Amino acid sequence: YLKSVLRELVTYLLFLIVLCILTYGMMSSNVYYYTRMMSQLFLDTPVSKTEKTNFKTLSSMEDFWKFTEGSLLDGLYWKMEADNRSFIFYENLLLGVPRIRQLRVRNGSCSIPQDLRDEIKECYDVYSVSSEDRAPFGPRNGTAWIYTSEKDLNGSSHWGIIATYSGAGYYLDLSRTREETAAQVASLKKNVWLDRGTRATFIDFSVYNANINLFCVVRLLVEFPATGGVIPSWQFQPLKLIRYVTTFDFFLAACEIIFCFFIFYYVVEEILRSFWNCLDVVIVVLSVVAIGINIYRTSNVEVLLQFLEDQNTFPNFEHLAYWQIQFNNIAAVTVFFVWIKLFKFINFNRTMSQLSTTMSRCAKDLFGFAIMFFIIFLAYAQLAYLVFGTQVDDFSTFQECIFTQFRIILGDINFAEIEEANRVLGPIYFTTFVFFMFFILLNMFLAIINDTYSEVKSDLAQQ
Amino acid sequence: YLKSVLRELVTYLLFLIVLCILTYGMMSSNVYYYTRMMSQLFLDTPVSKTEKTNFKTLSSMEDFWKFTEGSLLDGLYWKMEADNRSFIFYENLLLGVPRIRQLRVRNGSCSIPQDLRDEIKECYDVYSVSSEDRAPFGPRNGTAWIYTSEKDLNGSSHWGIIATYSGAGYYLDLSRTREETAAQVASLKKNVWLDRGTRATFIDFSVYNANINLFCVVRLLVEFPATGGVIPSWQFQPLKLIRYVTTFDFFLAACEIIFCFFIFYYVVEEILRSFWNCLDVVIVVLSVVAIGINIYRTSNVEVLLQFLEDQNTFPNFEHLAYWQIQFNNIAAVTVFFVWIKLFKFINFNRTMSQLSTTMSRCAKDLFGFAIMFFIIFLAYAQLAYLVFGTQVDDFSTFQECIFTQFRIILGDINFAEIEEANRVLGPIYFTTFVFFMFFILLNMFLAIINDTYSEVKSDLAQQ
Amino acid sequence: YLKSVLRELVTYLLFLIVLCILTYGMMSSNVYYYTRMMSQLFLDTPVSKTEKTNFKTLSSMEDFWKFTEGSLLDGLYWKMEADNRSFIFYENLLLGVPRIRQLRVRNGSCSIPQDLRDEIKECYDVYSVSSEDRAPFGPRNGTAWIYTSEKDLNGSSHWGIIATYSGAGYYLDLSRTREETAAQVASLKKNVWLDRGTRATFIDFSVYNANINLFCVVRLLVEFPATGGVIPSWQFQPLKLIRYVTTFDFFLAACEIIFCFFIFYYVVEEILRSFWNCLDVVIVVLSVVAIGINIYRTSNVEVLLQFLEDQNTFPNFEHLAYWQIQFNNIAAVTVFFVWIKLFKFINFNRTMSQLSTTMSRCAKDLFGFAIMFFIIFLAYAQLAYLVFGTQVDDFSTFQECIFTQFRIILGDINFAEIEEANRVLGPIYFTTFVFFMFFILLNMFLAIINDTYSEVKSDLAQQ
Amino acid sequence: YLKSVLRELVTYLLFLIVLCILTYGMMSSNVYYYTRMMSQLFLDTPVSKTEKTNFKTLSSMEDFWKFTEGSLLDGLYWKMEADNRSFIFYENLLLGVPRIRQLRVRNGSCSIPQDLRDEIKECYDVYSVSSEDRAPFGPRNGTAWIYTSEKDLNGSSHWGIIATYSGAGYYLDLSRTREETAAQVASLKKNVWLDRGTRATFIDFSVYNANINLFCVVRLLVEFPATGGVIPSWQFQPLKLIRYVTTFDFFLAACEIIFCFFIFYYVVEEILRSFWNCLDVVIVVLSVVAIGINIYRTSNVEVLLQFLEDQNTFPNFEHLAYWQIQFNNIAAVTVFFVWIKLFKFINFNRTMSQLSTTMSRCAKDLFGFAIMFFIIFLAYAQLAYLVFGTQVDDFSTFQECIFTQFRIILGDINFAEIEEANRVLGPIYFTTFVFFMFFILLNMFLAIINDTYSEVKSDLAQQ
Ligand SMILES: *[C@@H]1O[C@H](CO)[C@@H](O)[C@H](O)[C@H]1NC(C)=O
Ligand SMILES: *[C@@H]1O[C@H](CO)[C@@H](O)[C@H](O)[C@H]1NC(C)=O
Ligand SMILES: *[C@@H]1O[C@H](CO)[C@@H](O)[C@H](O)[C@H]1NC(C)=O
Ligand SMILES: *[C@@H]1O[C@H](CO)[C@@H](O)[C@H](O)[C@H]1NC(C)=O
Ligand SMILES: *[C@@H]1O[C@H](CO)[C@@H](O)[C@H](O)[C@H]1NC(C)=O
Ligand SMILES: *[C@@H]1O[C@H](CO)[C@@H](O)[C@H](O)[C@H]1NC(C)=O
Ligand SMILES: *[C@@H]1O[C@H](CO)[C@@H](O)[C@H](O)[C@H]1NC(C)=O
Ligand SMILES: *[C@@H]1O[C@H](CO)[C@@H](O)[C@H](O)[C@H]1NC(C)=O
Ligand SMILES: *[C@@H]1O[C@H](CO)[C@@H](O)[C@H](O)[C@H]1NC(C)=O
Ligand SMILES: *[C@@H]1O[C@H](CO)[C@@H](O)[C@H](O)[C@H]1NC(C)=O
Ligand SMILES: *[C@@H]1O[C@H](CO)[C@@H](O)[C@H](O)[C@H]1NC(C)=O
Ligand SMILES: *[C@@H]1O[C@H](CO)[C@@H](O)[C@H](O)[C@H]1NC(C)=O
């Protein structure tokens, strides 16, 4: 019997090191510095030589135009040998052409109160699919001034910080050289292409590095709330599109075939309470979804093929970059659970079995109290969100009030801005929360664990 | 019997989701960014193009005048279509006219020691109602140079950081356009309108956004301590004055009528130790006070009606903004306690009843020790306030010494400035406090909880 | 018997509120802002309009001269009505005249290794009383270039960050007006008054505010390590020299007489193990030392009397400012222990007596373990000081390694600079320390407390 | 018997204070400020008067050349008396001559995917020993353009942040005076000496201070990842090369002879489970390795002798600086364990023996759980490294994911950049980690300790 348990064990071990290789394989080492250099080049540099603002700092439309005609262009273009081709840092192709796209809301989307109608002529509602503006505003001379559908314009919905944004909109494709684009952008500034109705503008381009082999897909997102102002956000996503270059790449591709066999085998075994059963299900479920993504989605690479035909176009990678994120996310979570499955095999020792039986017994009591706990925890969260949240960034949304309260328990705090927001409840909230939660309530978990642990040591000693 | 308990339960649940809607309803989602853009526009921008100071940074009267003639004016005025009307960010009316007001203390308010009378001619005491200056200083040509009572000048006492300030004072109303105000402020600077005797100056104006429907009331407060210098502070308060625009607004107004019924019903039930009784009282008390505020106070909106008649005046919203703060505060605290009332219904399960009976028993022991605890805790607070508090900001006041000690327990610390203040007690205070409080004393709570918990598990197991 | 215990109790209570008044009385409320404005005026302002350095930032002698001829002069002088008198912020007399003093080390104080004697001509040792330079360097035209003894130059030893400094040295007194001093300082710069041999320079002046009644004594200390460079440090100390102005000042002076009676009475009672006895001794000891300081030291005020005779001199307050620090320190520590003496009276309740008997029993076990603990704790401290401490500021000295380890336990950390210092032990130190100390060892206290607590609840229940 | 235990005790005590002296002796007090001034002079100063970047901030090759021709030269040269000799801060010889060295990778080191070969002409692989470029690029006019082997160029492999770097490379030695070097560096800039193929450049020089007697060896390392950009790093290492100057130096040298005797004696005693035996072994092992380093390695000082002959050369100290690091590291770790050996002697008291027997019993249970713990801990680490690590600095490498998770437990967090990286898993990771690890799992240690402690108090009381 112990042999059969060890029989399935060695099976499991290989499944680890197979999976251990893919992750280490599918992720190059220093990639962090590849994004870091991109980000610092765009995000972190002064919008203009005389200006102190970053891209992260943009407060206004005026700042935005200074960015486009500013550090952005000077970030995208380098000379340097085509010379129509520009190597960022000299190591990185700007791949194809950048694209700017905006989203726009209709005039009468909202309604002015009858009292002020004599005062205010027109309003523009918060962005929504219903309120979107499809009208051909402006000179109507091209794709910049004419709406194009999300189908006709290949693209997908992007999820921003205040809203989700459709792929459709008013877009313009830039040019290969700095001189040509600077003309276009100037024209988009001369004519007013950012108006009261613009909610969001996207700037997307892709970069290819040949030293290591990686694409980098960039999305610079700028939102224009109905309240005025600017909310910048960005995404820098590396990709591995060309999977066969080095022999080591072929080495990995072998495993992805081998790794496919195991899952097929675990599906076989899984055919037929318990916790460890619920574990195996979760692994197999995610393991399939990972492969499903890896094949009929991320292995298509139809875009690259089209792009390499004509290199003057916009290389739309937004989807490919999207799925590999979803892939990496899922792949990681599998790996995590796969490690936890190892505890099933640690019961060899007395002391280990001594512990496992305790935590198994810990569960029913703790879970019962966690409910009691989070009801109180979420009460504060909802309280903090009503008192703060029009003031403090950390409390801005109900999601982030929850996260902030974890940071408080750990000691990450900005107390000053809490007290500035409300000089009465700010202190009361903080004090009472820190008191009841951190002093009394956290200790109530640890009370449960001691009892249930010492109890299990009591009776097992009786045996 | 269990049906009756469940009978009152479903009653309670509806009362939640009713109340859950109002809060979510009465608070728009992204409002945070509406204040954030206002604040960054005024607080966060350099006082002048050549100057590095914010409004938050003001160190002197000279800096203050640079702010008024500086970023303030350039923040309030935009061109842009009336053109007498100015849209901040282009989305936000500057509503009516700004108003500047100062407070002033009499000459002989204080007394010079007889030894130095030959040296120093005149002193000016710390601001107080007694020492306030009602004399018509200066050219005496208008409301700027003539005192006006808090009654005659509609307004209320504001509570600042070093003092409470009456609504009365010397005020001047600005103009609609940047050119006219810049003349006025220049005249207030030419003639000396900020002198030895000025303790505080207020800058108040209101802003209306039509996209979302919200007013924003702004108070820029600047204090001039008797010690010289400047202490800036600010308040940005959104308001919802016009309550019927969208159908969803009508949807909410229905609930506020429905919600009024429940409280009337709970008042009926409450007519006749125990803890849960003390809970219901607290809810009903606050729930009434909330409605009282909501009706005969915040539902008056007499000011708006007067303002819309003549739009060249100062739209005094200070009160309306005040009460909605008090309203939101009270509303939040009710919601908080309403959630806690849910524990009364969690006793269905064994394990829950297992826990409830423990924490009920935890109380008498913990409270007994908390007294023992805070006596020690407050001892340090008073110690730290005497040693520090002339040096370190965090210890500046006895209130904030208490808060600082919570931040220390959690790990939020600036130790450097503590050691700079006193190089001997600074370390001794910090060491001993962290030692006795965090090591020994916190653990004394958790000692109590373990005992009382394991005891309750002992005897209930006997049954 | 319970009456006698209550008889001594009410005696004790009055002693609190008497002492509670003096502290609140002897410390004005907003004084923090009085120093804060002084500090920001001097410390925090750019050394020159074109320079970005503060006084806190000084890296070099060149920076120092830029400070003296820079923000310092522009900080000390204001116009403004004598006009020979200058009111800082317009509220604050510059009192008398500033004074600059330096300390200097002899040439041959150190010894050059025989190998390099052909290379290096001369060395200057670290500052010490033995190596001090009394020679009249330079043009020898005045007190700036001639040594004056600590006796002949009224003054005391000051304790700096790298060394203790005698009051003696080479000093120069500045002038009343900005124009005259700027000439002097220029001459001290033209002629080289800061040379290889200068270890430290002091800048001392006093400021009087008449609105509130307080002096402010300032010491700007700049050290010049033997390694080259600059280490700035500062002290801003308020004082209350004139004790009778307001009636409330007379009100306090009454208590200081009353408060003297109590201590005389407690000395009577104390004439004749136990812990509470050891408490009363400590209070009475400190309470005497406080009064001793308060009378024959701080109540002398002979300097002020001399100063007010001739106001063109340097008002040496360094001692008076020193003692009131020592006074405030001692006064605070008494107050702290006085509160703790209150626990002697909390034994009325069962639960309180229930707790007191536990912590009394906790002592012998905890203290035994604390020894075991700090041996390990200090081991790391000594380890961290050897590995780091040539690199990381926080570990610079063995004293501060101890403090840093407390900050680590609480979560205040700069990990980056630890890893930069040593990329191997840095992580190992941090990991192992956080592991053994925070996981295992802290929990060993709490293990002791639970046992000894639950034990005391066990047997007392048997009674 | 107790005498013999005390007999070995006093032996041990002397061994402490002997060792206590050496450490305090071998480490001068204020050395921290000696490096701090060096670092701030080079690292912390603006690359140019018009530029805001430090050396720490370098983002590009262009920035690098601005640094060399910039603050570096102005940092190395001072006038000041030879005058060919330059005293940094006037206290510090620039010793000999600086040296710049770069490392270079071959053209075809990597391979371009066949699809893009028409596009991209050439690639340069990540630095490795295999891909290193030994070809004489450029004008081939000197050691700057010609490869020199690590043997022929005295030097050792340096371990950088992304790679290990051989001592070999293309180097150039600068000149004694600022004017001459500025010509050389200009020529290295005119001709392109930093190209696509440069992975890393080193700048090494040594500084001698005669006031205190210390050398300071400096390494300024700049890496050029294959992804483009710059990654600066630095090392400032003090040294004591000349060991006999002061009598106190002779005093220490006596102990190093005495200290050699003890280890010889403990080797004698150690000749022949238990834990304390395993302790003594570790001490003796390290104690030997320390002396081995101290004699046939660090006591050679052959370089200094050669250097003092001809002072126009490059004084290569890289090795000497290296070993004293290794020496200080080992010396510290010995001292640490030596303190812990003191617990062997604390068993005199009951309470101490009461504790020792507990922690001895704590071990087997805790260690069993630590395994269970770190499996979970490392699971998160591997998870966080896959999700983050292309984004967040703190997660950049798997090593640092581990360290980051310790900082999270303590409360050191940057949550913002976690949420920006991944807006879904970022919160989930952080929440679940903080929940399971900090709430449940940490408390599982403390559960073990309570049980095993109270158990030992149970049975010992029975005796
Ligand atoms: C928006 O609609 C209102 C409603 O009539 C109209 O008065 C205004 O001119 C419109 N503005 C634009 C830019 O279409
Ligand atoms: C549309 O008309 C404007 C007005 O002159 C012109 O500047 C612009 O170039 C035109 N658009 C295109 C695509 O030619
Ligand atoms: C979408 O993809 C199709 C596929 O060839 C292409 O023809 C079309 O131009 C794309 N749409 C764009 C680039 O807007
Ligand atoms: C303030 O009062 C004193 C008291 O006589 C007087 O000398 C001084 O001129 C007064 N100053 C002002 C501005 O009124
Ligand atoms: C008061 O007199 C001054 C002095 O000329 C003048 O500048 C100011 O305008 C006058 N005030 C008013 C309200 O006209
Ligand atoms: C106060 O309110 C009354 C009400 O109409 C108004 O007449 C008066 O002008 C207000 N006071 C001001 C604006 O100072
Ligand atoms: C310091 O002493 C040395 C020893 O002779 C001498 O050569 C040097 O000139 C002296 N320098 C000064 C400034 O006194
Ligand atoms: C000492 O001599 C120098 C040299 O001219 C002179 O500038 C300085 O003023 C003299 N000192 C005094 C106190 O006059
Ligand atoms: C020290 O105090 C005495 C007392 O009058 C005074 O005469 C002397 O000038 C003082 N020394 C100074 C100011 O250096
Ligand atoms: C690098 O190698 C490729 C391969 O042929 C060649 O085309 C290119 O010119 C080479 N570049 C340099 C700088 O040697
Ligand atoms: C190599 O040739 C270049 C080209 O003129 C010249 O500038 C450089 O000085 C030469 N190298 C040496 C070491 O002379
Ligand atoms: C290495 O050391 C030898 C020993 O004398 C020396 O001759 C040679 O020049 C050194 N190599 C250098 C400095 O590159």
Side-chain angles (χ1 to χ4, degrees), chain A residues 32 35 85 91 160 211 339 457, chain D residues 124 196 226 382 390 423:
Chain A
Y32 165 72
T35 62
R85 298 168 62 183
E91 297 303 322
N211 292 338
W339 285 98
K457 297 300 181 179
Chain D
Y124 293 91
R196 299 286 300 280
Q382 189 172 357
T390 61
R423 294 178 61 189

PDB file of all heavy atoms in Angstrom, chain A residues 32 35 85 91 160 211 339 457, chain D residues 119 124 196 226 382 390 393 423, unseen atoms left out:
ATOM      1  N   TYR A  32      12.139  42.070 -16.663  1.00  0.00           N
ATOM      2  CA  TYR A  32      11.772  43.230 -15.867  1.00  0.00           C
ATOM      3  C   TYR A  32      12.473  44.489 -16.338  1.00  0.00           C
ATOM      4  O   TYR A  32      11.846  45.543 -16.462  1.00  0.00           O
ATOM      5  CB  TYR A  32      12.085  42.998 -14.400  1.00  0.00           C
ATOM      6  CG  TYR A  32      12.063  44.287 -13.643  1.00  0.00           C
ATOM      7  CD1 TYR A  32      10.880  44.938 -13.384  1.00  0.00           C
ATOM      8  CD2 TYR A  32      13.232  44.863 -13.202  1.00  0.00           C
ATOM      9  CE1 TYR A  32      10.864  46.121 -12.709  1.00  0.00           C
ATOM     10  CE2 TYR A  32      13.222  46.042 -12.523  1.00  0.00           C
ATOM     11  CZ  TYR A  32      12.037  46.668 -12.279  1.00  0.00           C
ATOM     12  OH  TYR A  32      12.021  47.855 -11.599  1.00  0.00           O
ATOM     13  N   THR A  35      10.862  46.089 -19.606  1.00  0.00           N
ATOM     14  CA  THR A  35       9.737  46.991 -19.411  1.00  0.00           C
ATOM     15  C   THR A  35      10.173  48.243 -18.679  1.00  0.00           C
ATOM     16  O   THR A  35       9.766  49.352 -19.034  1.00  0.00           O
ATOM     17  CB  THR A  35       8.634  46.305 -18.626  1.00  0.00           C
ATOM     18  OG1 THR A  35       9.136  45.956 -17.336  1.00  0.00           O
ATOM     19  CG2 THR A  35       8.205  45.060 -19.328  1.00  0.00           C
ATOM     20  N   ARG A  85      13.366  53.478 -40.390  1.00  0.00           N
ATOM     21  CA  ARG A  85      13.198  52.625 -39.226  1.00  0.00           C
ATOM     22  C   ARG A  85      13.917  53.237 -38.036  1.00  0.00           C
ATOM     23  O   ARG A  85      15.018  53.773 -38.177  1.00  0.00           O
ATOM     24  CB  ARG A  85      13.747  51.234 -39.521  1.00  0.00           C
ATOM     25  CG  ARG A  85      13.006  50.553 -40.647  1.00  0.00           C
ATOM     26  CD  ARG A  85      13.720  49.308 -41.124  1.00  0.00           C
ATOM     27  NE  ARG A  85      13.833  48.298 -40.083  1.00  0.00           N
ATOM     28  CZ  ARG A  85      14.475  47.145 -40.234  1.00  0.00           C
ATOM     29  NH1 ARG A  85      15.058  46.852 -41.386  1.00  0.00           N
ATOM     30  NH2 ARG A  85      14.530  46.283 -39.232  1.00  0.00           N
ATOM     31  N   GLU A  91      18.292  49.375 -29.605  1.00  0.00           N
ATOM     32  CA  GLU A  91      18.060  47.943 -29.573  1.00  0.00           C
ATOM     33  C   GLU A  91      16.655  47.527 -29.982  1.00  0.00           C
ATOM     34  O   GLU A  91      16.422  46.333 -30.172  1.00  0.00           O
ATOM     35  CB  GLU A  91      18.343  47.405 -28.172  1.00  0.00           C
ATOM     36  CG  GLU A  91      19.777  47.579 -27.737  1.00  0.00           C
ATOM     37  CD  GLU A  91      20.755  46.927 -28.691  1.00  0.00           C
ATOM     38  OE1 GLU A  91      20.445  45.836 -29.208  1.00  0.00           O
ATOM     39  OE2 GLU A  91      21.839  47.500 -28.919  1.00  0.00           O
ATOM     40  N   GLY A 160     -10.853  50.186 -18.171  1.00  0.00           N
ATOM     41  CA  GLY A 160     -10.098  51.259 -17.567  1.00  0.00           C
ATOM     42  C   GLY A 160     -10.457  51.422 -16.112  1.00  0.00           C
ATOM     43  O   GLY A 160     -11.147  50.593 -15.514  1.00  0.00           O
ATOM     44  N   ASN A 211      17.555  41.278 -29.454  1.00  0.00           N
ATOM     45  CA  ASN A 211      18.701  40.722 -28.752  1.00  0.00           C
ATOM     46  C   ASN A 211      18.239  39.515 -27.969  1.00  0.00           C
ATOM     47  O   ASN A 211      18.512  38.376 -28.352  1.00  0.00           O
ATOM     48  CB  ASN A 211      19.320  41.756 -27.832  1.00  0.00           C
ATOM     49  CG  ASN A 211      19.962  42.873 -28.586  1.00  0.00           C
ATOM     50  OD1 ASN A 211      20.312  42.724 -29.750  1.00  0.00           O
ATOM     51  ND2 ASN A 211      20.129  44.006 -27.930  1.00  0.00           N
ATOM     52  N   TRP A 339       1.922  22.959  -6.017  1.00  0.00           N
ATOM     53  CA  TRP A 339       2.754  22.861  -4.823  1.00  0.00           C
ATOM     54  C   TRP A 339       1.945  22.399  -3.627  1.00  0.00           C
ATOM     55  O   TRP A 339       2.374  21.519  -2.878  1.00  0.00           O
ATOM     56  CB  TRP A 339       3.416  24.195  -4.519  1.00  0.00           C
ATOM     57  CG  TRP A 339       4.526  24.497  -5.412  1.00  0.00           C
ATOM     58  CD1 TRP A 339       4.498  25.285  -6.509  1.00  0.00           C
ATOM     59  CD2 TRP A 339       5.853  23.999  -5.304  1.00  0.00           C
ATOM     60  NE1 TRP A 339       5.735  25.326  -7.094  1.00  0.00           N
ATOM     61  CE2 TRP A 339       6.586  24.537  -6.370  1.00  0.00           C
ATOM     62  CE3 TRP A 339       6.496  23.150  -4.406  1.00  0.00           C
ATOM     63  CZ2 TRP A 339       7.928  24.257  -6.563  1.00  0.00           C
ATOM     64  CZ3 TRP A 339       7.825  22.874  -4.597  1.00  0.00           C
ATOM     65  CH2 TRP A 339       8.529  23.424  -5.667  1.00  0.00           C
ATOM     66  N   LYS A 457      -3.295  17.651  20.683  1.00  0.00           N
ATOM     67  CA  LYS A 457      -2.151  17.065  21.362  1.00  0.00           C
ATOM     68  C   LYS A 457      -2.572  16.325  22.615  1.00  0.00           C
ATOM     69  O   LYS A 457      -1.886  15.394  23.042  1.00  0.00           O
ATOM     70  CB  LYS A 457      -1.128  18.140  21.696  1.00  0.00           C
ATOM     71  CG  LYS A 457      -0.582  18.783  20.464  1.00  0.00           C
ATOM     72  CD  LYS A 457       0.072  17.727  19.616  1.00  0.00           C
ATOM     73  CE  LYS A 457       0.665  18.320  18.370  1.00  0.00           C
ATOM     74  NZ  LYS A 457       1.327  17.282  17.561  1.00  0.00           N
TER      75      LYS A 457
ATOM     76  N   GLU D 119      14.505  42.362 -42.136  1.00  0.00           N
ATOM     77  CA  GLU D 119      14.349  43.607 -41.390  1.00  0.00           C
ATOM     78  C   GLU D 119      15.623  43.937 -40.620  1.00  0.00           C
ATOM     79  O   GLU D 119      16.329  44.894 -40.947  1.00  0.00           O
ATOM     80  CB  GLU D 119      13.145  43.505 -40.450  1.00  0.00           C
ATOM     81  N   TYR D 124      22.859  41.522 -30.646  1.00  0.00           N
ATOM     82  CA  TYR D 124      23.932  41.321 -29.680  1.00  0.00           C
ATOM     83  C   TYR D 124      23.366  40.634 -28.454  1.00  0.00           C
ATOM     84  O   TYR D 124      22.500  41.188 -27.775  1.00  0.00           O
ATOM     85  CB  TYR D 124      24.585  42.640 -29.293  1.00  0.00           C
ATOM     86  CG  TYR D 124      25.336  43.289 -30.413  1.00  0.00           C
ATOM     87  CD1 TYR D 124      24.720  44.192 -31.247  1.00  0.00           C
ATOM     88  CD2 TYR D 124      26.665  43.001 -30.634  1.00  0.00           C
ATOM     89  CE1 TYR D 124      25.402  44.784 -32.266  1.00  0.00           C
ATOM     90  CE2 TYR D 124      27.357  43.595 -31.648  1.00  0.00           C
ATOM     91  CZ  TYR D 124      26.721  44.487 -32.459  1.00  0.00           C
ATOM     92  OH  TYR D 124      27.411  45.084 -33.481  1.00  0.00           O
ATOM     93  N   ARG D 196      26.745  49.267 -29.570  1.00  0.00           N
ATOM     94  CA  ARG D 196      25.732  48.245 -29.365  1.00  0.00           C
ATOM     95  C   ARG D 196      26.249  47.110 -28.500  1.00  0.00           C
ATOM     96  O   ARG D 196      25.500  46.549 -27.696  1.00  0.00           O
ATOM     97  CB  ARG D 196      25.302  47.688 -30.716  1.00  0.00           C
ATOM     98  CG  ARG D 196      24.690  48.682 -31.664  1.00  0.00           C
ATOM     99  CD  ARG D 196      23.298  49.038 -31.247  1.00  0.00           C
ATOM    100  NE  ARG D 196      22.453  47.850 -31.229  1.00  0.00           N
ATOM    101  CZ  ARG D 196      21.906  47.307 -32.310  1.00  0.00           C
ATOM    102  NH1 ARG D 196      22.123  47.838 -33.503  1.00  0.00           N
ATOM    103  NH2 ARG D 196      21.148  46.228 -32.199  1.00  0.00           N
ATOM    104  N   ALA D 226      20.956  43.821 -22.656  1.00  0.00           N
ATOM    105  CA  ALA D 226      20.676  43.606 -24.066  1.00  0.00           C
ATOM    106  C   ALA D 226      19.398  44.293 -24.498  1.00  0.00           C
ATOM    107  O   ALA D 226      19.168  44.460 -25.696  1.00  0.00           O
ATOM    108  CB  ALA D 226      20.591  42.115 -24.363  1.00  0.00           C
ATOM    109  N   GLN D 382       6.697  31.874  -5.614  1.00  0.00           N
ATOM    110  CA  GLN D 382       6.735  31.483  -7.012  1.00  0.00           C
ATOM    111  C   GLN D 382       5.534  32.031  -7.760  1.00  0.00           C
ATOM    112  O   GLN D 382       5.646  32.411  -8.928  1.00  0.00           O
ATOM    113  CB  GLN D 382       6.793  29.971  -7.129  1.00  0.00           C
ATOM    114  CG  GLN D 382       7.045  29.495  -8.521  1.00  0.00           C
ATOM    115  CD  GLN D 382       7.287  28.013  -8.569  1.00  0.00           C
ATOM    116  OE1 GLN D 382       7.311  27.345  -7.537  1.00  0.00           O
ATOM    117  NE2 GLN D 382       7.486  27.486  -9.767  1.00  0.00           N
ATOM    118  N   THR D 390       7.706  40.806 -14.136  1.00  0.00           N
ATOM    119  CA  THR D 390       7.926  41.563 -15.349  1.00  0.00           C
ATOM    120  C   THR D 390       7.516  43.007 -15.171  1.00  0.00           C
ATOM    121  O   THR D 390       7.660  43.802 -16.099  1.00  0.00           O
ATOM    122  CB  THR D 390       7.146  40.953 -16.496  1.00  0.00           C
ATOM    123  OG1 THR D 390       5.756  40.993 -16.177  1.00  0.00           O
ATOM    124  CG2 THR D 390       7.558  39.523 -16.677  1.00  0.00           C
ATOM    125  N   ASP D 393       9.410  46.110  -9.425  1.00  0.00           N
ATOM    126  CA  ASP D 393      10.805  45.954  -9.038  1.00  0.00           C
ATOM    127  C   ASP D 393      10.954  44.943  -7.917  1.00  0.00           C
ATOM    128  O   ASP D 393      11.807  44.053  -7.975  1.00  0.00           O
ATOM    129  CB  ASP D 393      11.379  47.301  -8.606  1.00  0.00           C
ATOM    130  N   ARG D 423      -4.478  44.247 -11.954  1.00  0.00           N
ATOM    131  CA  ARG D 423      -5.580  44.789 -11.180  1.00  0.00           C
ATOM    132  C   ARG D 423      -6.502  43.723 -10.629  1.00  0.00           C
ATOM    133  O   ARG D 423      -7.456  44.062  -9.930  1.00  0.00           O
ATOM    134  CB  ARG D 423      -6.393  45.757 -12.028  1.00  0.00           C
ATOM    135  CG  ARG D 423      -5.655  47.005 -12.428  1.00  0.00           C
ATOM    136  CD  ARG D 423      -6.542  47.843 -13.308  1.00  0.00           C
ATOM    137  NE  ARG D 423      -7.751  48.230 -12.596  1.00  0.00           N
ATOM    138  CZ  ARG D 423      -8.788  48.830 -13.161  1.00  0.00           C
ATOM    139  NH1 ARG D 423      -8.771  49.102 -14.455  1.00  0.00           N
ATOM    140  NH2 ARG D 423      -9.849  49.141 -12.435  1.00  0.00           N
TER     141      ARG D 423
END
